Amino acid sequence: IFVYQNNITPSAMKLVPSIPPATIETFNEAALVVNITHHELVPKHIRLSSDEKRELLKRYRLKESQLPRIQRADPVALYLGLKRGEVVKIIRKSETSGRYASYRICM
C-alpha cells in the first residue's frame, strides 16, 4: 500500500502492475483522514473465501452474473482491497427483519 501526499507521476504509475503476483495499491493521504467505513450509512462488508463464494452460488443456484455487483473502485472495495471476482457479504439492519444479508460480486 502506497500513501501519497498530493500526486504520483504517470511514469511511476507504470510500475504498479509490473510486479505480479504482488499487487500494489495507491491511496491518497487526504482521502484516508476519515474512515468512510465508520459512517452511519456504510454497512459491514465481509470478503468471502473462494469456498465461501462457491457455496453461495451453489446454495442459491446462481451464475456469477445473477449476483448483485460492486465496483472495483467502490470506497469499501478499495478499503477491503477487493480484487475482481471476490464476493463481499453485506450485513445491514432492516426495518422488516432485524438483520438482512446481501452479497455483492466485484467488477
Partner: protein
C-alpha cells in the same frame, strides 16, 4: 387460422434475431416483383404478374391464393423480392456501416488493430457482444494506417509482420445517406461506393467480424447493405379496394412502386447509354427510396412527401410506440366482450356486485359447454331466445359452425348435444372485470358479481368508490367478460373486491365507510341518540344476517329506548375486539372519545373515520384479518343498510346558515385581521428607515417579506380558528368535518372567517406593472392589500382587487395540476416498465427476466405486504427500572418471584435454582433484544409494521376461554420458557438443509421474534394476560399458523406491485413545496429528479452534525459555520481602483499618507491598485484586514507588494504595487484574479450555511429516551469529500440529499441508503404511507448493478434483458434494428415477450406447470 392443421402445435421459446442474406430473400420469395403496376393489364381489373399478383396473396375474396389456395382469413401472405440494380445502405444501419468501416482497413478487409496491441487484448477480452464492438471502435477509429509490420510482445526493437497491406485510411464523415473519406500536398476527397463498402465487408474474416458485434450465421456485416429487397405480401400493405371501378392501394405499395420505378431507371441507364454522372444520380434516388421506405422521419433531410403533401408512413413509423404495433397493438388492444357506460352509486348493492343494465347483459355472452348438468337449463335459455333477458345468442355445434338464434329456421327446435357450446347471456352472479382508467392500481381493476338491473347505468357499491377513484360527476367505466371456466376462476379466486379489501400498498385497507354512511354513523353512535321500538324493529329487519333476537333495550323502565351504539353493534360480528385511545380517553370515556368493541359489541366512543373508515387499525382492517374477506364484504353492506336507513329518516342538510359565524366572533375576526394589518405596517416603516437587520443568508427584502407573509398567515389561521371554535355542534359543516365525511378546518376558515394571502410562485402577487400590482394602486405599495391578501370570507365576498388576486393564484393551481398529471403519468409508466419482470420465485428470492437477484427474500423479511400491521416493541422504550418491573422473574428473592396467586406452582417454585437458570437465560436474552432493537431503531420508535397481531391473538384468547384474572394459572415455568422457544423454530420463511439458507431463515425472523419474546415473557404471560395451559398453547398455535399465512406467495408479481405502489401515491401529490428551515424541492419534481438520477439537482444541501460533546454549544457550531461558509474577496470589496502613485514613499491619496509611514517602519511599480473593503461586510463574515491581507499576500507571493490599513482606520484600504512597457493592463488582470479567483475562508460550493437547533431522541442515564436538541449546520452547497475531513464535525453522521455524491464517497451500499431516504421523503412529504418493500425494491433495482442505474430510456432500457422486452418502451425500432445486426436471442421469459407472442406469461398463475398423474388418477377411481 381457423381450419384443422396436421402440423404440431408448439410455443415460441426463442426469438433469433438476424439479417436477410440476399440469398435467403431469393429462396423465400414466391414472386420476382417486376412491374410497378398493380393490375388492369390486358383490360381485366384483376392482379398483374408484376406487383401484388396472386404469386403473393389475394386482393379479392376469391378463395384463390395461387400459392397455398387457402383464402384471406387463413393465408398470412407470401414474400416477394426486387433484385436491386446497385447496392443500397439499410437506412437503420448507415452509422454502424460507417463505424465498421472506421474499424477495418478499406483495402484488405483486416481488423485495423491486431491482438499485438495490449489495449486491443483488453477490448477483445470483453465477453459482452456490444460493449466489445464499442471498445474496439474507440481504439480502431484513431488508427489511420494498415500495419504491414508491428513491434512484437517479445522485444519492440525487432518488429514482426502481422500481414495485410500498408494503405492509408480515410477520415469518414456521413453526408445524408452517403459516406465520404479524407486520405493524406492537400488531403484526398472521394465518396465511398456502396459496392466498395460491401466488398470490404465481404473480405472481413469470420474471426474478425465475430470479434466485432456480428454473427457468422445470422448477422454478417455484408447483409447490412441491400442487394435483394423483400416485397411484403398484400396483408402488410392492404388494398382497401372500395367499389368495383375504384381501388385504393396502401402507402407502402406506392413506396415500393416508387422503389421499383427508380430501380428500372437505374437498371436501363447503366445497361444502355450510361452518361455515368447521371448513373450516380439515379443510384442516389434508389438509395433514397429504399432508405425512406424504412424510415421517413430521417435526421435533417427532406421528408419523402406523398402527392398530397402528406409525409408517407415509413415502416419505422408503424411500430414507433404509444400507437405503433408494439405499444398500441400488442401491449394494448381493443377487445371483444367488453362494455362501457356511465356509473351510478347504489346503496342497495352488495360490496362485490356490479349493476349491469339489461341491454348490456343481453349483448355480452358466455360460451357454456352443453354438459349433463346444464343441458336441461341451457335448452331453456336457447328457447328463451336472444331477445328475452335470460336468453342465448348462438349455439355452436361441434362441427365448428355457428347457429344464429336471431334468424335460424331451427331456432325453435334446436335439440342440444353434449359438447356443443351455448353462447348464453351474462346472468346474475357471473364474475366480470370492472375497471376505471387510469389503471395505476391492482385495485383499478377488480372482479365483481353481475346483478342484471334496468336503466342504462353501471351501478356500484359506494364503499368501492375509493379504489376505483370514481365520482358520479358523469364518470364512465369498463366491464370485461371472461370466456373460459378457467379465467372465471382467475377472477373469482384472485381479483374479487372482497379479496382486494386490505391493500399491500400501505398494509392497510383500501376501502372504508364513506360520505352518507360516514356522516350518518357519527350521528347514530351517540349518547344522545336513542331509538323507539317501531324503528328499532325495522332497523333490525334491514340487517340480512340478523339472528331474529330483539336486543334488550339500554333503557327499560321510563320507556323502552335503544342507543345507536347498541343496534349498530348488530352489524358488528361476534369475536371482533377493538380498543382505541384519543386525547383524554379514560375507561369511562368523557367526550365519547376513542373506541371500545368487545365480542363485536360497542361499549363507548363515537364511530367515525378513525373507526369505520380505511384506517390502519380499522374496524374494517380487524374484521378482514379476524373473520374473512367474505365476512368483511358483508359487514360493508350491513353497516350501510342500517346507517343509510336511519339517516333517510333522521335526515341531513347544509345551508348558508352553516357559514354564518356569530356576530361578536366576527368582530373578533375583523379585529384579528386589523391588528395583523398594523403589525405589518410597523415592519414596513421599520424596514423603510434601514433599522430592520437582515436575517443570515437573506436580503433585507427576503427577510421583510418572510415576516409579512408570516403575520398575514398567522392572522388567517387564528381568525379561522375563532370561527371553528364559535361554530355549534349543530353546524352541519362542522358535523361533516367531525365525522370526516367532507370538509377541513381551512374550508370553514375561508368560508366563514378569512380567505387569506394569495400566492403565485411562492411570493405574494408581484408588480406586473411598473412598481404596482394593478393601476388601482400607487407605486412602491408593499401593503397586504396590494400584494394579494384577501381580508374577506367567501360569505362576505371578495372585492375586485381581491377577486383578481385570488384568480391569479387560483390559475397557478390549475396549471400546476395539469402539469403534475402529465409528469406523474410518465413516472408511473417508467416505474412499471423498469420493474414488470420482478417476481418472487419458489426459492423466496426476488428476481427478474435474467434471473438476476434483486432482493434475497422479498422486502428483506419474505412477508406479503397485505398480512402486516403496525405493532409496538415494548422491550425498546422506557426506563431500565420499568423493564426490570415488567420482565424480571427471580425465584431466588422473596419480593421478586411470581406470587402463588399467579401460578399453581408459585409456593414450590421459590428457590428452584435449576428453574432460575431458565429465567436468568430468558431475561439475559430479553436484555440482548432491547440492545439490538436500539441498534436498529436508533430514535426509539417502537411502532413498526410486523406480521402477526399478537395483541389481538391474546385478546381473542381471553374472550375464547373466559379467562378469570383472579384464579392461579396451570402453566409451569418450563411450559412458557420452553414453549415460546419451540414456537420460534416453527416460524419458517425459508426451508433448506444447509447453513446459508438456515442462517438466512434466522435473519428473516430476527425482528418478529424480538416482539415474540417481548410479548411472551414469563412475567407477562402470567401477571398481565392471565393465560391457562390451554389459552397459551392456543395462542402459540395461532401465532404459528397466522405467521405461516403472512409469508409471500411464489408468483407474487412484486415488480409491478412496487411500481404502482409508488406511482399511484405520486399522482395524488399537490406540491411543489407549500407557498412561503431549508426550502428543498420536494414531491413530483423531486421524484422526477430522483428517478432520472439527475446530476444537477435543484436544491443540493449538506447536513453537518456537531462532534459528540459539542451538541449543546451554539458557539462551537458558530465556529464550524464560520470554518465552512465560502467567503470570497469579492463579497467584502466596495471598489477596485487603479491609481498612478510613482513614489513608493509618498502618496497622491491624502488618506493613505498615514498607512505608508507605519507599513514602512518595523524598485516598486508606479501603478497602485487600491481596494476599499466594507466594515459591515467584514463583520458579517467576521474578518480582519490582516486576514484579508495575508490571503492576497499568499496568492501572488513575491510578485505583489501589499500594504493595508488597520481595523480602526476610518476607511478600510489595501494598496497593491507590482514587483520587478505595458504594465497598467497587467493590474486589470490581477484585479479580477483578486475578486473572482481568491477564496478567503470556508469550503468551496458550501455557499449559505444555516444554524439549526434540531431536536433528538437519545437515552438518558435512567434508561428512557429524552429530547436532547443539538446544533446542526445546513447548506446551500455540496462538497462531502472535504466537509467530512473538517475538524469539530461528526463524519459518522453527515448526510447529503445528493445521493449521487454519498455513493461516490461512502460506497454503493451506503449510496442505496441515501437513495431510499430521499424516495421515502418525497412520499412522506405528501404525508402518504407506502410500505418499506415497495420503495426498497425500486431502490434495490436501481442499485444491484454496482452503481446508480437510472429509471430512463438510457438506464434500465439499456440492460441485458430481452430485445422485444426493451423495445416495448422508448427506443423500439432502434432496439430491434440492433437486435438483428448483433444477432440477439430473446429468452422469452420477460412478461412483455409472452404478451407479444400471445402466450401465457410465467407470472403468478403461469409461474408453475400442471400435470396429470395417471397413478393418483387411477387411485381415485
Amino acid at each position: 387460422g381457423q381450419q384443422y392443421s396436421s402440423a404440431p402445435l408448439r410455443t415460441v421459446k426463442e426469438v433469433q434475431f438476424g439479417l436477410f442474406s440476399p440469398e435467403e430473400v431469393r429462396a423465400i420469395s414466391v414472386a420476382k416483383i417486376r412491374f410497378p403496376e398493380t393490375m388492369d393489364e390486358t383490360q381485366t381489373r384483376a392482379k398483374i404478374g408484376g406487383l401484388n399478383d396472386p404469386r403473393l396473396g389475394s386482393i379479392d375474396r376469391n378463395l384463390k391464393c395461387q400459392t397455398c389456395q387457402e383464402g384471406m382469413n387463413e393465408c398470412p401472405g407470401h414474400f416477394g423480392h426486387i433484385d436491386l440494380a446497385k447496392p443500397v445502405f439499410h437506412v437503420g444501419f448507415i452509422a454502424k456501416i460507417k463505424k465498421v468501416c472506421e474499424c477495418v482497413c478499406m483495402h484488405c478487409g483486416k481488423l485495423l488493430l491486431d491482438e499485438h496491441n495490449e489495449l486491443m487484448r483488453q477490448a477483445l477480452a470483453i465477453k459482452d457482444s456490444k460493449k466489445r464492438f464499442a471498445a474496439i471502435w474507440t481504439l480502431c477509429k484513431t488508427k489511420m494506417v494498415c500495419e504491414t509490420d508491428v513491434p512484437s510482445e517479445d522485444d519492440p526493437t525487432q518488429l514482426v509482420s502481422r500481414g495485410g497491406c500498408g494503405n492509408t485510411q480515410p477520415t469518414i464523415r456521413k453526408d445524408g445517406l452517403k459516406l465520404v473519406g479524407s486520405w493524406k500536398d492537400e488531403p484526398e476527397l472521394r465518396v465511398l461506393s456502396t459496392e466498395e463498402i460491401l466488398n470490404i465487408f465481404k473480405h472481413i474474416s469470420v474471426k474478425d467480424f465475430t470479434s466485432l458485434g456480428f454473427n457468422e450465421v445470422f448477422s454478417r456485416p455484408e447483409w447490412m447493405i441491400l442487394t435483394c429487397l423483400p416485397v411484403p405480401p398484400p396483408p402488410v400493405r392492404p388494398s382497401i379496394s372500395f367499389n368495383e371501378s375504384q381501388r385504393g392501394e396502401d402507402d407502402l405499395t406506392f413506396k415500393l412502386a416508387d422503389i421499383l420505378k427508380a430501380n428500372i431507371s437505374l437498371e436501363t441507364l447503366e445497361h444502355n447509354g450510361a452518361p455515368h454522372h447521371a448513373i450516380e444520380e439515379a443510384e442516389s434516388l434508389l438509395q433514397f427510396h429504399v432508405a425512406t421506405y424504412m424510415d421517413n422521419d430521417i435526421a435533417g433531410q427532406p421528408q419523402a412527401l406523398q402527392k398530397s403533401g402528406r409525409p408517407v408512413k415509413s415502416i419505422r413509423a408503424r411500430l414507433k410506440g404509444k400507437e405503433g404495433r408494439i405499444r398500441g397493438n400488442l401491449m394494448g388492444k381493443r377487445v371483444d366482450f367488453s362494455a362501457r357506460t356511465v356509473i351510478s352509486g347504489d346503496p342497495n348493492l352488495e360490496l362485490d356486485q356490479v349493476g349491469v343494465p339489461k341491454s348490456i347483459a343481453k349483448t355480452l355472452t358466455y360460451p357454456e359447454v352443453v354438459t349433463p348438468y346444464n343441458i336441461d337449463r341451457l335448452t331453456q335459455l336457447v328457447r328463451n331466445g336472444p331477445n328475452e333477458h335470460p336468453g342465448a345468442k348462438y349455439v355452436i355445434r361441434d362441427s365448428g359452425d355457428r347457429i344464429d338464434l336471431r334468424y335460424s329456421k331451427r331456432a325453435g327446435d334446436i335439440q342440444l348435444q353434449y359438447g356443443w357450446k351455448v353462447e348464453r347471456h351474462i346472468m346474475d352472479n357471473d364474475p366480470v372485470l370492472f375497471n376505471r382508467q387510469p389503471s395505476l392500481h391492482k385495485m383499478s381493476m377488480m372482479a365483481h358479481r353481475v346483478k342484471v338491473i334496468p336503466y342504462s347505468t353501471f351501478r356500484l357499491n359506494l364503499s368501492v368508490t375509493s379504489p376505483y377513484n370514481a365520482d358520479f360527476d358523469g364518470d364512465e367505466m369498463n366491464l370485461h367478460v371472461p370466456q373460459s371456466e378457467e379465467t372465471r376462476a382467475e377472477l373469482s379466486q384472485l381479483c374479487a373486491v372482497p379479496l382486494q379489501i386490505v391493500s399491500p400498498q400501505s398494509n392497510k385497507p383500501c376501502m372504508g365507510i364513506v360520505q352518507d354512511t360516514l356522516c350518518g354513523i357519527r350521528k347514530l353512535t351517540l349518547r344522545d341518540t336513542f331509538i323507539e321500538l317501531d324503528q328499532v324493529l325495522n332497523m333490525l329487519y334491514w340487517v340480512p344476517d340478523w339472528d331474529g333476537v330483539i336486543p334488550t333495550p339500554a333503557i327499560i323502565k321510563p320507556k323502552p329506548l335503544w342507543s345507536g351504539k347498541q343496534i349498530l353493534s348488530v352489524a358488528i360480528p361476534n369475536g371482533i375486539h377493538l380498543q382505541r385511545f384519543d386525547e383524554g380517553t379514560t375507561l369511562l370515556s368523557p367526550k365519547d372519545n376513542g373506541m371500545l368493541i368487545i365480542d363485536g359489541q360497542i361499549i363507548f366512543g363515537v364511530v367515525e373515520k378513525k373507526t369505520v373508515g380505511s384506517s390502519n387499525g380499522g374496524l374494517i382492517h380487524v374484521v378482514t384479518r379476524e373473520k374473512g374477506p367474505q365476512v368483511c364484504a358483508k359487514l360493508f353492506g350491513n353497516i350501510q343498510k342500517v346507517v343509510n336507513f336511519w339517516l333517510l329518516h333522521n335526515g341531513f342538510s347544509t345551508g348558508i346558515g352553516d357559514t354564518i359565524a356569530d356576530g361578536p366572533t366576527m368582530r373578533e375576526i375583523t379585529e384579528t385581521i386589523a391588528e395583523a394589518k398594523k403589525k405589518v405596517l410597523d415592519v414596513t416603516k421599520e424596514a423603510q428607515a434601514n433599522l430592520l437587520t437582515a436575517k443570515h443568508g437573506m436580503t433585507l427584502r427576503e427577510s421583510f417579506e418572510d415576516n409579512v407573509v408570516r403575520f398575514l398567515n398567522e392572522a388567517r389561521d387564528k381568525a379561522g380558528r375563532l370561527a371553528e371554535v364559535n361554530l355549534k355542534d349543530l353546524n352541519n359543516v362542522k358535523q361533516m368535518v367531525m365525522a370526516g365525511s367532507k370538509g377541513s378546518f381551512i374550508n370553514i376558515a375561508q368560508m366563514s372567517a378569512c380567505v387569506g394571502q394569495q400566492s403565485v410562485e411562492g411570493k405574494r402577487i408581484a408588480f406586473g406593472f411598473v412598481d404596482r400590482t394593478l393601476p388601482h394602486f400607487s407605486k412602491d405599495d408593499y401593503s397586504p392589500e396590494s400584494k394579494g391578501f384577501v381580508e374577506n370570507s367567501y360569505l362576505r365576498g371578495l372585492t375586485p382587487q381581491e377577486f383578481f388576486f385570488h384568480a391569479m393564484g387560483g390559475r397557478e393551481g390549475l396549471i400546476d395540476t395539469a402539469v403534475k398529471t402529465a409528469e406523474t403519468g410518465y413516472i408511473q409508466r417508467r416505474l412499471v416498465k423498469a420493474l414488470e419482470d420482478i417476481m418472487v420465485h419458489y426459492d423466496n428470492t426476488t428476481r427478474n427476466s435474467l434471473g438476476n437477484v434483486i432482493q434475497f427474500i422479498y422486502g428483506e423479511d419474505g412477508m406479503d405486504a397485505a398480512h402486516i400491521e403496525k405493532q409496538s416493541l415494548d422491550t425498546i422504550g422506557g426506563s431500565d427500572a420499568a423493564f426490570e418491573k415488567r420482565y424480571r422473574v427471580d425465584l431466588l428473592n422473596t419480593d421478586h418471584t411470581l406470587d402463588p396467586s399467579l401460578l399453581e406452582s408459585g409456593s414450590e417454585i421459590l428457590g428452584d435454582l435449576k428453574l432460575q437458570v431458565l429465567l436468568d437465560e430468558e431475561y439475559k436474552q430479553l436484555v440482548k433484544d432491547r440492545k439490538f432493537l436500539r441498534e436498529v431503531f436508533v430514535d426509539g420508535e417502537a411502532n413498526w409494521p410486523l406480521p402477526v397481531n399478537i395483541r389481538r391473538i391474546i385478546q381473542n384468547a381471553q374472550q375464547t376461554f373466559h379467562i378469570d384474572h383472579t384464579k392461579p394459572s396451570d402453566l409451569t415455568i418450563k411450559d412458557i420458557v420452553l414453549g415460546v422457544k419451540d414456537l420460534q423454530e416453527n416460524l419458517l420463511v425459508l426451508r433448506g438443509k444447509n447453513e446459508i439458507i438456515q442462517n438466512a431463515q434466522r435473519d428473516a425472523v430476527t425482528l418478529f421474534c424480538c416482539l415474540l419474546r417481548s410479548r411472551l415473557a414469563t412475567r407477562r404471560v402470567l401477571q398481565e394476560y392471565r393465560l391457562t395451559k390451554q389459552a397459551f398453547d392456543w395462542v402459540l398455535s395461532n401465532i404459528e399458523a397466522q405467521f405461516l399465512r403472512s409469508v409471500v406467495h411464489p408468483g407474487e408479481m412484486v415488480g409491478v406491485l412496487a411500481a404502482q405502489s409508488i406511482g399511484e401515491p405520486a399522482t395524488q401529490m399537490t406540491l411543489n413545496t407549500f407557498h412561503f428551515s431549508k426550502k428543498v424541492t420536494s414531491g413530483v419534481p423531486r421524484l422526477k429528479e430522483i428517478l432520472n438520477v439527475a446530476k444537477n439537482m435543484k436544491t443540493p444541501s449538506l447536513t453537518v452534525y456537531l462532534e459528540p460533546g459539542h451538541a449543546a454549544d451554539q458557539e462551537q457550531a458558530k465556529l464550524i459555520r464560520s470554518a465552512i461558509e465560502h467567503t470570497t474577496l469579492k463579497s467584502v470589496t466596495i471598489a477596485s481602483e487603479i491609481y498612478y502613485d510613482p513614489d513608493p514613499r509618498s502618496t497622491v491619496i491624502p488618506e493613505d499618507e498615514e498607512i505608508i509611514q507605519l507599513h514602512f517602519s518595523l524598485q516598486q511599480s508606479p501603478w497602485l491598485l487600491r481596494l476599499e473593503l466594507d466594515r459591515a461586510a467584514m463583520n458579517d463574515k467576521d474578518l480582519t484586514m490582516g486576514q484579508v491581507g495575508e490571503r492576497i499576500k499568499q496568492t501572488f507571493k513575491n510578485d505583489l507588494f501589499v500594504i493595508w490599513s488597520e481595523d480602526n482606520d476610518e476607511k478600510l484600504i489595501i494598496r497593491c504595487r507590482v514587483v520587478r512597457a505595458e504594465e497598467d493592463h497587467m493590474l486589470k488582470k490581477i484585479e479580477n484574479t483578486m475578486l473572482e479567483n481568491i477564496t478567503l475562508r470556508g469550503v468551496e460550493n458550501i455557499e449559505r450555511v444555516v444554524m439549526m437547533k434540531y431536536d433528538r431522541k437519545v437515552p438518558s442515564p435512567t434508561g428512557e429516551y429524552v429530547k436532547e436538541p443539538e446544533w446542526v449546520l445546513e447548506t446551500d452547497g455540496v462538497n462531502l469529500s472535504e466537509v467530512m475531513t473538517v475538524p469539530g464535525i461528526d463524519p459518522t453522521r453527515i448526510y447529503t440529499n445528493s445521493f449521487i455524491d454519498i455513493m461516490e464517497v461512502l460506497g454503493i451500499e451506503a449510496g442505496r441508503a441515501a437513495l431510499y431516504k430521499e424516495v421515502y421523503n418525497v412520499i412522506a412529504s405528501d404525508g402518504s404511507y407506502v410500505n418499506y418493500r415497495h420503495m426498497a425494491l425500486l431502490v434495490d433495482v436501481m442499485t444491484t448493478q454496482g452503481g446508480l442505474t437510472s429509471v430512463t430510456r438510457h438506464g434500465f432500457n439499456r440492460s441485458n434483458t430481452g430485445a422485444l422486452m426493451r423495445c416495448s418502451f422508448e427506443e423500439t425500432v432502434e432496439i430491434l434494428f440492433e437486435a438483428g445486426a448483433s444477432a440477439e436471442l430473446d429468452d422469452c421469459r420477460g412478461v412483455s415477450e409472452n404478451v407479444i407472442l400471445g402466450q401465457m406469461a410465467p407470472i403468478g398463475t403461469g409461474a408453475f406447470d400442471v400435470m396429470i398423474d395417471e397413478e393418483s388418477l387411477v387411485k381415485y377411481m
